[PDB]
Structure formats: C-alpha cells, structure tokens
C-alpha cells in the first residue's frame, strides 16, 4: 500500500458512449464507493445461474439503487492507480453542471473522452452542437491540457482494426478543432461492459499493440485505460504561491468569535499569519485553523477550512471576499479587469453594456461588458479585429469588465482559481472567461 499523489479527472462523452459504465467499472474495481450495495448485488447475482456474475450487471443494479435514493455514499467518487488517488467526475448532462465545472472546486488534471465505436453512435457524438464538444471546449479553455480518448463498444464493431483507425482519425480531427494536439493523446480501444483494456489487456484484438503519447521527456506507451490514467502527468500544486482563500461562509460562534470558511486555492494558511480580506481591505491575525474534526498546523491548497480571526465582525466580511497574506502579495479589490471570453451556444448576441451575473470563485456579482476590446482566434490568441461591435456564439474576445459591487479577482496566470469565471443568463452559462489583467 504505497503513498499516492492526488489528481482530478473528468469523463466526458455522448449519452450512448457508455461512459457511466466505463467510469463505474474503474470505481468498482479500483475504488471503494457504495461497497455495501455492491456486495448485496454480488450475492444476489447467484440467482442468474450458479454464482457467476458480470461487473456490468452489478453496476446496473447499483444505478437503480441510487435512483431510489437509498444508497449511502455521497457523489464524491475516487479510485486508485499505482501512482495516484484519482477523484473522478462522470460529467453530468445537467445544464447547471457547466457553471459547476467552471467555478466548482477540483478542476481536472485530465479529461477522458469516451467515444462509441458503433456506426450511428460515433457520428452523433461529434456533432459541433453537442454537449460533448462543449465539455471538451470548456476543459480546453480552463487549461485541462491532458486528454485520454477511449473508444468504447469495440465488441459491437467486432474489434475491427480499420474501424478503430478511422475512429482515431476522425476523433483526432474533432479534438484538434477544439485545440488538443492528438500526438499527446492516448487512444485506447475498450469494452466498458466486458472489461477489455480497462484494467487488463484485451485478447480480442491481436492487431492491437497498445496506445502511445508524446510527452516532453519521450514517448509513453501502455495497453490499458488504467495504465493511461496512471500515466497522467503530475501537475504542480500552488503550495508556495501567496495565499488566496475565497470565502464561502462567515459564522459568529459564541465564545470563539468570527469564523470565515472557504477553500485554500493557492498558498498555505497557518495560525499566526496576518491576513487581509479583499474587496474591503480588513487585516487581522489567524488565531487557529480547523478542518473536519482536526485542528491544523496548516491548511494547504484544496483544504476547505474554518479559521478564527479577532476584531472582524461577520458584517464586514462576506461570501465572495478573498482572504490572502498581508505580507505576500495581499489580495485587492479591483476597479475593472480584462478577460478573454469564449461565448458558448446560446439564444442571443452580446454588445457592450451587457451586464449579466458572473460567478468567480465564491463571488456572484453582475459585471458590465464595458468594452469589447478585441476579437481573437481562439486557439492561437491572435487578434482578428479591434473593437468588435458584438460577439456571437463561438467567438473568443478580450473584454473589459467593470464589477457592479466591490470584487476581488486575479489574473488566471497567477492565481487560477480566482481567474476563471462563468457568465450566467437565460437559465444557462452563456460564456466562460479567463482573466488576463486586473486594475487593482
């Protein structure tokens, strides 16, 4: 039982791709989620014959049990690989997941695109207007640079090499248009149901020599999807960056005082540090830090911590404000910020003056699109025109934003979690933004 590093993975794909069975299989055989329910169905399966059972059958029963609302475990799913503890999201098709994908905690280190290999299922999955492409575009825009492609349902096409090759060609085109470099992407033929190439190599494809990907140090090869996941590159965590901790809630506890709560996005928080809260600019000492049941010596990137501070009323700091270190690039409110905005598909056009609500870290504030400064080629960033008169679906543009209320944001290059945002309107996320400059 070796010590593991932590990574986040998001699984995307069309409704017929079989991505839930595929993700479910990995969690079942490499993790420990809803195991008492799994055990109940493994025993029940004896009824099908004389004892043997398929993992897919158990997953089907687990799904129905979850639908009834009687399973016990929460929706935070994890599984292990030789090197990692993986937190995985089988992306929901729910439209409210888009905002959650942009501002939620745990942004992905790698996206796994599941592709149905069948004849009419593959084409349906790569439609330009499909939810799958939107998810891929969002991941790319948010900096998810690693991608793994799994071509599922290979049994349905009799593990035909030509079909796999054509699918790889067409999928490479699909992802290249989004922005990914296919040479850095492993393409794994699998059967989520039968288990081929999931954890163990398939015996149904003698032509299969394995997957490969180019990395900065050389070429990495493997056979299975689990190997591809274990091959994900170790991303650098922001432990040494200045502290940034967006507030989620603020409590007034008898006998303790003010206790803000939030996720440490960058840097580390420790008792004894002197912190500043922005947009207000209030400064104070951190008295103690707690998480779950433990008192901490430090809260590191990813920890959702409570901390007690003196001489700050709950009325002067609130959700959306950002806590940072007063002696290491303290956070500041801004007069405005310029960001690259990617307009998603929606029933409207954007003109200067537009003032929708933006969700950035824990802040929820209406911000004016004060000026449309440029229109750009999305993938390269090249300026196409100065001062476009309007933006339509698909456009990438540099926009100057003016917040309607005091707001603390950061450039994405410096503090990623405080530099990406979702634009809300018409009951959906209509645009995603990446902050490029801030006027503090």
């Amino acid at each position: 039982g070796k010590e593991k590093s932590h990574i986040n993975v998001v699984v995307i794909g069309h409704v017929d791709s079989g991505k839930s069975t595929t993700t479910g299989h990995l969690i079942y055989k490499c993790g420990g989620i809803d195991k008492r329910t799994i055990e109940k169905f493994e025993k029940e399966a004896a009824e099908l014959g004389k004892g043997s059972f398929k993992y897919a059958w158990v997953l089907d029963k687990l799904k129905a049990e979850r639908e009834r609302g009687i399973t016990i475990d929460i929706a935070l799913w994890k599984f292990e690989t030789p090197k990692y503890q993986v937190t995985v999201i089988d992306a929901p098709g729910h439209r409210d997941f888009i905002k959650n994908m942009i501002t939620g905690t745990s942004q992905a280190d790698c996206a796994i695109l599941i592709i149905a290999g069948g004849v009419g299922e593959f084409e349906a999955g790569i439609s330009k207007d499909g939810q799958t492409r939107e998810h891929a575009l969002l991941a790319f825009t948010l900096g998810v640079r690693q991608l793994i492609v799994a071509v599922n349902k290979m049994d349905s096409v009799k593990w035909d090499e030509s079909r796999f090759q054509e699918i790889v060609k067409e999928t490479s085109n699909f992802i290249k248009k989004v922005g990914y470099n296919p040479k850095t992407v492993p393409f794994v033929p699998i059967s989520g149901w039968n288990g081929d190439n999931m954890i163990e190599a398939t015996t149904n494809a003698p032509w299969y020599k394995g997957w490969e990907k180019e990395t900065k140090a050389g070429v990495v090869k493997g056979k299975t999807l689990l190997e591809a996941i274990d091959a994900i590159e170790q991303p650098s965590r922001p432990t040494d960056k200045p502290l940034r901790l967006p507030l989620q809630d603020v409590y007034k506890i008898g006998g303790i005082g003010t206790v803000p709560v939030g996720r440490v996005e960058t840097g580390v928080i420790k008792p004894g540090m002197v912190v500043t809260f922005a947009p207000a600019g209030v400064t104070t000492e951190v008295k103690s830090v707690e998480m779950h049941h433990e008192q901490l010596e430090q809260g590191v990137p990813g920890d959702n911590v409570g901390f007690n501070v003196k001489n700050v009323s709950v009325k002067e700091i609130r959700r959306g404000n950002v806590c940072g270190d007063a002696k290491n690039d303290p956070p500041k409110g801004c007069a405005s910020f310029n960001a690259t905005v990617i307009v998603l598909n929606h029933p409207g056009q954007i003109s200067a003056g537009y003032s929708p609500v933006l969700d950035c870290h824990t802040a929820h504030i209406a911000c004016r699109f004060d000026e449309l400064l440029e229109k750009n080629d999305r993938r390269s960033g090249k300026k196409l025109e100065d001062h476009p008169k309007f933006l339509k679906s698909g456009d990438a543009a540099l926009v100057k934003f003016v917040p309607s209320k005091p707001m603390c944001v950061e450039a994405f290059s410096e503090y990623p979690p405080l530099g990406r945002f979702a634009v809300r309107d018409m009951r959906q996320t209509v645009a995603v933004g990446v902050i490029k400059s801030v006027d503090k």
Binding site: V15, K19, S20, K63, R66, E67, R68, G69, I70, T71, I72, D73, I74, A75, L76, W77, I89, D90, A91, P92, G93, H94, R95, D96, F97, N100, G104, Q248, D249, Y251, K252, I253, G254, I256, V259, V261, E290, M291, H292, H293, N304, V305, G306, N308, R319, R427
Partner: protein, 90 residues
C-alpha cells in the same frame, strides 16, 4: 428513460446552535417533479458547526439546481447558504 444526475448538496446553518433536524426536515419537504431526496448526514466543519450534506437525484430536464438551491435558501431562519459538494451523471 430520462437523463439524470445525482447531486450532493451542502446546506450551511447560521451558527452552532441552529436546529439541524428542522433544517433537513425543511429541505426534504421540498417537492419537485423529477426530484428524489436521498441519504444525508450532519458533518462537522470546525468550531462546533455542522453542515447538512444531502443527496438527491434529479431529472436534468425537469429540475433546475439553481432553483432548488434558491428554494432551500428561503428557509432563512436555518439556512445561511447552499453549495454543490459534488455531482455526477447517472
């Protein structure tokens, strides 16, 4: 069948004295076509405060999570805020 998602919501109280049983009873009393309430637990977050962590399964086309969060938040006497702890496709 209709597309669904399983969601875990964190419902936060005002302080360490908030009546948590009332808070969850109010959440569970919310009825929406396509919404199924699941398991819940009260989880310590530090300093004696506990948040409600509750599962629900929703039909994507019928249940707005934005609306559900807003509805839960109407119980101002018990609820300070709600957040999505995690969500998955089913």
């Amino acid at each position: 069948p209709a597309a669904k998602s399983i969601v875990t919501l964190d419902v936060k109280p005002w302080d360490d004295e908030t009546n948590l049983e009332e808070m969850v009873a109010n959440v569970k009393a919310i009825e929406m076509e396509g919404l199924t309430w699941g398991a819940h637990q009260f989880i310590p977050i530090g300093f004696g405060i506990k948040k409600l962590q509750i599962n629900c399964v929703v039909e994507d086309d019928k249940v707005s999570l934005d609306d559900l969060q807003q509805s839960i938040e109407e119980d101002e006497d018990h609820v300070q805020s709600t957040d999505i702890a995690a969500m998955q496709k089913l």
